[PDB]
Amino acid sequence: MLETLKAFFDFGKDIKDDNYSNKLLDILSYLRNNQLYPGESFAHSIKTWFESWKGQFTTVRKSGQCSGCGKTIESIQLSPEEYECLKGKIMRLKRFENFIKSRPPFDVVIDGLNVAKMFPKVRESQLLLNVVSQLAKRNLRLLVLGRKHMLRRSWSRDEMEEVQKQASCFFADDISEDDPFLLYATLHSGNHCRFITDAKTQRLFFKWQQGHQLAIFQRILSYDTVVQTTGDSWHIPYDVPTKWLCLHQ
Ligand SMILES: [Cl-]
Ligand SMILES: [Zn+2]
């Protein structure tokens, strides 16, 4: 589909209807609101179309600070109001709710089932413990969302006991869905908590996810990797990617 969209940018160089241009800008806004990134050849067409504006293919510093503008890429951290927005509408089972509310916030919410079943070679009671042990080395509060299945041999427990002594474990019924509990416990704990597993808010969810998801651990950046603009500038990631199209005018 990106292939088709690119072709309309190419047509844009000669089509100087400024009503046509604002439909091309709508595409850019669609990319932003849905965490999509153009291909490299699509990026070239965007740069080229805008220049009919100065474009440069660049990278982003550790506190980017784009190498091209010197401008600072949008922050990945949610504002207190933005976070209280996204939080409210995700919660929009009471044993779990109780479990959370009678306890201090957590730092990492771990989807035990999906984490354990991702490196299929090793036993999954072992894999969970390994993830927990590496994280408990820094004294974080850990909530492991598990199932009654984990406390039934054989998921050697044994090994689950070592898990429960370094992480807090809530064992939901085996039929329960994973996503609701993880989203609740993480968002309830606060903007600081991370996890392992409308248009403005769907964007917020995407910003929140990118800045709070621990990927097996991958580093979380200071800045937000999305198509973005300030009016005088556009910053478009392409080909999360690390290459950026820099536009300023
Ligand atoms: Cl697509
Ligand atoms: Zn730049």
From Swiss-Prot:
KW Hydrolase (keyword) present: yes
Location (main, coarse): mitochondrion
Induction: Down-regulated following mitochondrial unfolded protein response.
Binding site for Mg(2+) 1: D111, D178
Limits of the PRORP domain: 60-246
Positions bound to Zn(2+): C66, C69, H235, C246
UniProt keyword list: Disease variant, Hydrolase, Magnesium, Manganese, Metal-binding, Mitochondrion, Nuclease, Phosphoprotein, Primary mitochondrial disease, Transit peptide, tRNA processing, Zinc
Protein function: Catalytic ribonuclease component of mitochondrial ribonuclease P, a complex composed of TRMT10C/MRPP1, HSD17B10/MRPP2 and PRORP/MRPP3, which cleaves tRNA molecules in their 5'-ends. The presence of TRMT10C/MRPP1, HSD17B10/MRPP2 is required to catalyze tRNA molecules in their 5'-ends.
Similarity section: Belongs to the PPR family. P subfamily.
Protein name according to UniProt: Mitochondrial ribonuclease P catalytic subunit
Organism: Homo sapiens (Human)
Gene name tied to this protein: PRORP
